[PDB]
Amino acid sequence: SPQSVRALLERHGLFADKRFGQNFLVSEAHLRRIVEAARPFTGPVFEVGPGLGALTRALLEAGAEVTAIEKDLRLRPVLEETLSGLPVRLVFQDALLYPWEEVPQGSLLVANLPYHIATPLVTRLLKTGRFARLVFLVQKEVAERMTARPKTPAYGVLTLRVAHHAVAERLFDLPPGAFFPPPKVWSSLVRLTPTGALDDPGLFRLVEAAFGKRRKTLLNALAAAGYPKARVEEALRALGLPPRVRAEELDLEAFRRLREGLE
Ligand SMILES: Nc1ncnc2c1ncn2[C@@H]1O[C@H](CO)[C@@H](O)[C@H]1O
User: Fold this and answer.
1) Where does S-adenosyl-L-methionine bind?
2) Last residue of a domain, which of 168, 198, 228?
């Protein structure tokens, strides 16, 4: 309950710290949903931000082999208490500094992610190609970006970054009350299933150029970013797109074809 979480924090003399984006998950039902979205545990599990150990314990109980990476050293006593008797590798480090590129092929990310590192962290883990599934909570707006369809406000670079590497599902929305202390926004449970592609720097130079100048048509954004105007005009024409088409109108395959057209 929010009651029990509040009481656990108080007993350990802890306060939720905004510098760590600390919002701890309350309900067993939400923990269950996260575990069920991530199972079966066919590879090692990495959890970023175990916090009070609620999800960590659920994972371990489900038979997962877990490495949990926590930046706040103050959470060590509560984590040791919650996880007493259970095989966990507890690592106290900034997860943005963890050697992600070397995790075993087939690893799973399962985590209530700290809002302020979620986007760069997920981007990096997707680039590794090492994960079978990534299952995590993120702010609802970030979830919407990760699962956007073309021609919408949320559609952009992050959408295309996730799509290039993976299929994306928004499985459930969680109200601020699902956490203690409650955040100011809703969160969502997201599942990413990598589909094989590693980074494609050329593709993302194009995508980032495409979305850099948001008030411009695709042609002008790309031209202003140093792509030869005539070649862009021709590639767009060749794809049967209107001269003044905008970046948000193109799906992943369309960007791939555009890139192939320009090269
Ligand atoms: N950079 C980070 N690496 C690992 N854990 C983090 C980081 N930033 C915040 N956390 C932890 O993530 C959890 C978010 O609820 C908290 O336990 C918080 O302390």
Assistant:
1) 23, 25, 49, 70, 94, 112
2) 198
* Domain-ending residue, one of 142, 172, 198: 198
CA distances from 97 to 91, 93, 135, 185 (A): 12, 7, 20, 27
Given in angstroms, what resolution was this structure solved at? 1.5
Range of the domain at 32: 1-198
Mutate to test the pocket of ligand 1, among 26, 72, 79, 174 (most ligand atoms within 8 A of CB): 72
Q: Which of 48, 139, 180 maximizes ligand 1 atoms within 8 Å of its Cβ, making it the mutation to test the pocket? A: 48
Residue 25 labeled ligand binder: yes
If phi over 0 gives left and psi between -120 and 50 gives alpha, with beta otherwise, what is residue 42? alpha
Count structural domains, the chain: 2
